[PDB]
Design a binder for this molecule. Sequence first.
Ligand SMILES: CCSC[C@H](N)C(=O)O
Ligand SMILES: CCSC[C@H](N)C(=O)O
Ligand SMILES: CCSC[C@H](N)C(=O)O
Ligand SMILES: CCSC[C@H](N)C(=O)O
Lengths: 396, 396, 396, 396
Amino acid sequence: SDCRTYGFNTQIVHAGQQPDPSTGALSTPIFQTSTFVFDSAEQGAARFALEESGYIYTRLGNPTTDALEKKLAVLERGEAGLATASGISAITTTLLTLCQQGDHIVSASAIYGCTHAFLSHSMPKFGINVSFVDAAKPEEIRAAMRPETKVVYIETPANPTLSLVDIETVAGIAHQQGALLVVDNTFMSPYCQQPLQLGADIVVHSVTKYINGHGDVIGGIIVGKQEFIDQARFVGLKDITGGCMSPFNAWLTLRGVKTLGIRMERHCENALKIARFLEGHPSITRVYYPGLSSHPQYELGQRQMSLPGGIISFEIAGGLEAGRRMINSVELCLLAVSLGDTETLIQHPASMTHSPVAPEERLKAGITDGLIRLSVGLEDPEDIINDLEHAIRKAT
Amino acid sequence: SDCRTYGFNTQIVHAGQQPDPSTGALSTPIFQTSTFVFDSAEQGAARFALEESGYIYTRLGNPTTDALEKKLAVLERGEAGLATASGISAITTTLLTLCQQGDHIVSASAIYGCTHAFLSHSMPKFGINVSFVDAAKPEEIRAAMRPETKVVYIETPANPTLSLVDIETVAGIAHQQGALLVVDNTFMSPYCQQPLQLGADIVVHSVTKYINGHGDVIGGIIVGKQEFIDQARFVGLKDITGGCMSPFNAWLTLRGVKTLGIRMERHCENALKIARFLEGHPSITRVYYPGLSSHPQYELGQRQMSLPGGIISFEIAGGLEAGRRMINSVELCLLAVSLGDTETLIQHPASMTHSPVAPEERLKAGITDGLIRLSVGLEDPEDIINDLEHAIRKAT
Amino acid sequence: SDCRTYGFNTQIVHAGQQPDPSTGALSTPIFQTSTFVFDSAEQGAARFALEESGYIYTRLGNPTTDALEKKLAVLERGEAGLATASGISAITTTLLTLCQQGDHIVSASAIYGCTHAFLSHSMPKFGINVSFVDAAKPEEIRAAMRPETKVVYIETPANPTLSLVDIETVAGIAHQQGALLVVDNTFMSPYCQQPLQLGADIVVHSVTKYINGHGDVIGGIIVGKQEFIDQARFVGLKDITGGCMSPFNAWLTLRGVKTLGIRMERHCENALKIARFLEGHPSITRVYYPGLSSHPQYELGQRQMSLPGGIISFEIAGGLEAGRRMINSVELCLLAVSLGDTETLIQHPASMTHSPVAPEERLKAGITDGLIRLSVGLEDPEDIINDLEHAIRKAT
Amino acid sequence: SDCRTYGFNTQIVHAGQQPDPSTGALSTPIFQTSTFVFDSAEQGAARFALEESGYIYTRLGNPTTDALEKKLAVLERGEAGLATASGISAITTTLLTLCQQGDHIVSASAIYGCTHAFLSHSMPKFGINVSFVDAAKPEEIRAAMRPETKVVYIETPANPTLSLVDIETVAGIAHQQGALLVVDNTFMSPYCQQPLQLGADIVVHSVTKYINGHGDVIGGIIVGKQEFIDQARFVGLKDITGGCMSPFNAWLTLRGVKTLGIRMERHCENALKIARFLEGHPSITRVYYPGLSSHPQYELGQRQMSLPGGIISFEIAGGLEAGRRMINSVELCLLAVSLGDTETLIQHPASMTHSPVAPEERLKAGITDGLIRLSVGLEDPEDIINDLEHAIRKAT
Ligand SMILES: CCSC[C@H](N)C(=O)O
Ligand SMILES: CCSC[C@H](N)C(=O)O
Ligand SMILES: CCSC[C@H](N)C(=O)O
Ligand SMILES: CCSC[C@H](N)C(=O)O
């Protein structure tokens, strides 16, 4: 039949994949090769002319990575996919393909840190200017638009406090002003949010997080229209970033994504229980989780997201020292800085990653001294709750 | 002892590597992980402050990839190494780290095609201008230098006719005018040429070719001073290209490079025999190989290169149709477009990769209708010669 | 804390694993090595004398495989684990370690085919006799016991019709007569059945099935008391079968088992819906599934198994030709002979694997002409049901 | 053309391999799968009936492993190959396929230790008796033959003192008495010795050593006539040992064997230089190396082996304590117990692996207190010699 006609779980398992034609091998073979052999000069010419289908060289394309790209295109309801060496490379390959000297980008301020560094420091040095706004307020996006604006860039949910951005509304604004909307969908995965269905033009992911899910792959993916993806591939990736994904990494990501549906369900079921526990704890001042009704954009979240996600942020009583004591007291949660793994990961930005940053600067950035970020894993929630409860009691 | 004190073969095997400290495992473990766990908040802070040694996240660094980077730094006699997703990413991470809007690059014209595309089309769109010159003529390099010139960029030997560039002389010119010399050393490998020893500031490789050698890895490496490499890592790679190497790819490259010395010796021994056979064949008009005394820069090659290399180009009588017939007639050599693999690879650019390009344009580019490029593998040279002889006789 | 104290899901994720001590790497490193280096002669001696902990050589032991062995030991509530090259090797390493010439085994008749071949043909040629009985009738097991009986061997659920064996009752019988009970727990996984908790002495698995779950690993595991496992390792594996597991295979199995809990839940949820659909279909004469109340040993299944499993067998109206037409008509289910993968797999033994076997022989073996076996995957059950319904209607 | 017609180096690179038919991928794809899908019931039946070519299930066969098996069959000049989980599994799968209760084996005494354990302790418990003889004396082999003798088993060169066995002569004796000759060719590799060409019926290897060469694979291979290999596969491996090789392990071995020729050349060139250095050292009482003219079977070695090998044993003055001091004093050579890796490995059996064994027993076994075994790697021989010289001077 056709990949795109089955149920979403079926697509997660099957889309982009089929038994190997030569052998019937069920697992997508790992085409861990650099080059491909032509049967004749004609055959080699035909392929270079984009006049015959087939492979040439792994930086350009690869059967294993192609399977991943097709699957993710199906899952996001986009035309085509392009795998990359990292989530960052997905973002930069995209933006460096779209923008040139003199161009402009409107970006949410509440975005991934390394993305913020690329936009704040690197882009301007190539003559590409970026205006940062509070994307939770679509009017700020509109107001920042210029004749030169090529792209509006957003994440949702966003760190550190899991605020949201109204994708459909922002897409409408961007398009009216002649710009593309690029959405980083890393936090949700296509299982929980589909930006393209809401008007976004391009979706990027760090597959390092939920899509792979097993904390053993750095990688990215870009999903969008064929004609954009072709430029991202044959110019952005081929010439500019060189950020191609290893076939083995693609194969691992294909393997990891097989369980995306059941993983997201459990991540989110666990996170809701943990979020409710934290909201009931008198030593916890705030809990940021889209699944709690007190979330400022709760109703937007319910329309836009099928599940509230596996990530929670919360503030512990007693600021910096309490936050430090707490993360130093967990026995099961692991201290680390990524998310979307099968293990529960915890971080305390003020003492761990922003310790030398000025307190008042962190505060402007939404990072309070007592803020803890939690990536909820697949353990028994009771165990995670018990660990948190133990650590919190100790810290306070 | 110290890595850097042993003989070159010993270094190839041992440099950058040692038994795993926890287990004694001899093979470098494949640290196929995305994140790393901190023992405490303090420990996590110390590492983010570049104030304690250790790992954080694989895009930033990884024990497996670190071993590769250290080995290649030793082999090129440079301070530090940085692995990348591809040779292209090694090149662009380097140049995009060094250059910004308003800057200028002087580049050899005779360079890898995708590199030429990045420099010709992509760089100018970021406000970075590039002047192309014939680098076999160091005076053209000097004449093209501007107050804005940050980098002089060269390959040697160069495609398609394996012309050379005098690294030491070019380095002297570049430095006098306040620019860095970047050398793409892919064709030679550190076993055959050491640009840093001749005054180059930075060396890049596609490890896809000889360094890995097994035609199953796309990857790159950058070698240079610590303070440049740190910027290439923490800005160029982290923020701009995102072109990090997969740990599995690093491990394969480490494994492949173990045999670099014996592989280069055999590649070059084979290529010399094949080059001599071709030079003796009345149906072959020209043979381009640094190991033949008739090579225009033969003596430069003998001073600069320890071996003449594993790559040969040659022109077959009868132009385009003869070239086509010949590559269509080989039975052992494989039709493909990479090089430095254990198998002999052959390509006929005029009919395979530049077929729709205008004849007079290809000619300006040094690609004649009858030009064949041969990457000599590890087969018995007698067999390769017999295959070529059979194919040539048929073609003519 | 201690692995064995957490909830079962927590154990699935964490047991046997921890961050790498040298680097903090979260993913268990792939120690893809053959040998291990000693710091001194003394250190090498100490380890060979089983007088110091550490590694020597991968056939004997390996840090990656050790993690897998410890995890599975925890999950089955056994003392120790031993990974093998295949489920068959787990079985034969076990039995060839326990038995010698003159010994005797009582085995269920309803067992995996290759196991039946080893017991029927290979064991007797080594002077080890085997008596086959209907293990659904514990009195047949008792009656077959001899003074020479060392082992009673069972699978449950068993192919082809998913009949059960009362583990606790059989264990009691075996022990009273001085024999060990070995249980092949492949079909259930430790998530659904724990034979050691019911009195079994040794559990074996083909991890090829549910434990790995991703259809890309052939492997086995043995779980039991330390002193038996030590003999299975240092004699059975080291000397007799040589059936060691590759570290990469262990790492993949570790990765796959991370999602065992959520996978089994979904497999079993899907299979129950599909089993009920089949039981309601007038073209289906019989449905074999422990989750259906009409199952002859339904109540035993409810006491012994936490879930009814992901495997269904059923008989289609019209015998051989109908069975053939049906499997030839599925569009989503894949025709293949393993089970426990994320994709739904289907097989029709009478036309596919036992076609040249005599009809009356297959019948004695419980394989009727119209019997279909279905391994339910993680697709949307609605899609699988629709596919089956389409195929069945066509076939009948 | 045909694999078997090219030169040996060409075969090493190409035999058993070709570009992937579906994609042209040059590297053999890693078919890391457990099962294979059939297009129809008929197609599945045809394959189970050994009536159509194709795959079924990885324990039975796999495209990646098939490539390895075909290559090694070509290199040993045998009909067919069978890959296994380890060298031990290659040996036991072979012998357990050939022998049953009541059968007899004549084996060399000077064999691999674990092999000796299997033959001494395990085989007799299955009713298969083994007589050990000094295979350097073919008359002892003849004298030990019985009507029940099915197999004569030898290694050459043999540990610990690299004595030889005359393969052709022993084959003649074995065949006259109606037995098969099985030769463990691990030490030589097919590049240096071809037992089948000298009359042996079956060759086994631990590919863990030189064939893979990179110290990161445990594996074995069996090479022989098709009808024996078919039994070894479909009975020995399928039913008895279950010792199948992982596809990833096969792929690594394929990759490693690409450089077998150039590796053996360098191993042997290095070992000869080191052997000569040791023979000239007044602190070294004996040097065992087939390349030294004083070797007792020197001329046999020159007829039977194309190169003298990469392994050296030698006795240091001062017995046990000197041997201990010496291995504790090396700085470059690595203390470990395998061989055939790219790194130089050293071991001192009397203090490291046989320390608790009785002195007079070790002596009977040819292991003197001062005996050191050296696996020469690919480092600069000058460096290895310098390391040895330093360590020896210190030890004495
Ligand atoms: C600089 C490390 S950022 C680590 C991870 N990507 C995260 O989601 O926080
Ligand atoms: C666009 C493919 S270029 C292939 C290979 N890098 C070469 O050296 O020619
Ligand atoms: C001989 C292939 S058996 C395939 C698979 N092990 C099964 O469960 O049926
Ligand atoms: C019991 C370890 S034996 C290690 C290696 N196989 C050797 O050749 O000695």
